[PDB]
Amino acid sequence: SQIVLPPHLERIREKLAENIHELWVMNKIELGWQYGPVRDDNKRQHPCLVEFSKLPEQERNYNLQMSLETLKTLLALGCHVGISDEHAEDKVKKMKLPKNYQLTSGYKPAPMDLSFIKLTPSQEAMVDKLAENAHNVWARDRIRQGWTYGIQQDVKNRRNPRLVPYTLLDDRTKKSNKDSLREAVRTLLGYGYNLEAPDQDHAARAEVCSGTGERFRIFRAEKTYAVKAGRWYFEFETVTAGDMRVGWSRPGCQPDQELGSDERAFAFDGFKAQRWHQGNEHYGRSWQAGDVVGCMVDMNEHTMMFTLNGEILLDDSGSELAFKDFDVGDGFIPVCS
């Protein structure tokens, strides 16, 4: 609402709403809706099939406002307007209509040959976000009327199943509102205004919206299973690649501390390929989904090793050992974060 429409944009706003009226005339007279004063689309009735006024001029100015808040959505997302010159405004290669795709009267739609005008993939992304915003506006307006989500439609209970996030919206309404807004962007382009696309801003939510304040879940064996001598082996299977660690920990590891951040554990972080004991150092490769890590500890000579899908992981140098100088302490138990 605080966004003010530039004069550049508003002096062609009128032609934009005119051509959206022209979109009803073309689309309805082509797909079969003939002229009808009431919106009885069931029996192919079209009230929008005539010049601005005879279809309610309040609806024509509603199209004016559709252009207004559409370009305001462009500025709110950050889509800029690009004008070269009023000669580019006058540039029209008058696109021709048969009577089937043309309205009965002389309010003839003919901007230009929109076929060759193309969209950047980023531009299509912003157009899809425009459709997103329009769908949210519609759904919230329905909420203002007092509607709600459902699986079957009941106007008595005001339960529309279509009230869902746009990602889960049904593809039929989805393609209709998409291609409609795509054509609206085509209209804006054919009236000279091209958009100098805003930079595709890069971001990431870090996938950290877990249960309350938890960030990891440490799984260890019982403290009475600690091994102080011999050679031992266990496998860790990676179902989903991500922030996971595996290794051997002392029988004093704190459940709320990240594995390897202290002296109480010896872990392998294959997400970013480090080795964790009081700090991180580059080690080994990075796993994928279904990868199996094999942890091997030999307390006789105090060494540790890791294997990804059979092959031994090595350090930055050619050393096979992952941890080679540590005391026996109270033993070690398998652990994974």
Ligand SMILES: Nc1ncnc2c1ncn2[C@@H]1O[C@H](COP(=O)(O)OP(=O)(O)OP(=O)(O)O)[C@@H](O)[C@H]1O
């Ligand atoms: N007379 C009109 N002709 C075309 N679009 C209109 C008209 N009045 C309002 N609109 C806008 O265009 C949309 C067209 O939606 P549509 O034709 O599918 O019907 P609806 O009233 O939204 O509901 P339904 O999906 O149940 O038919 C409306 O939701 C509204 O935003």
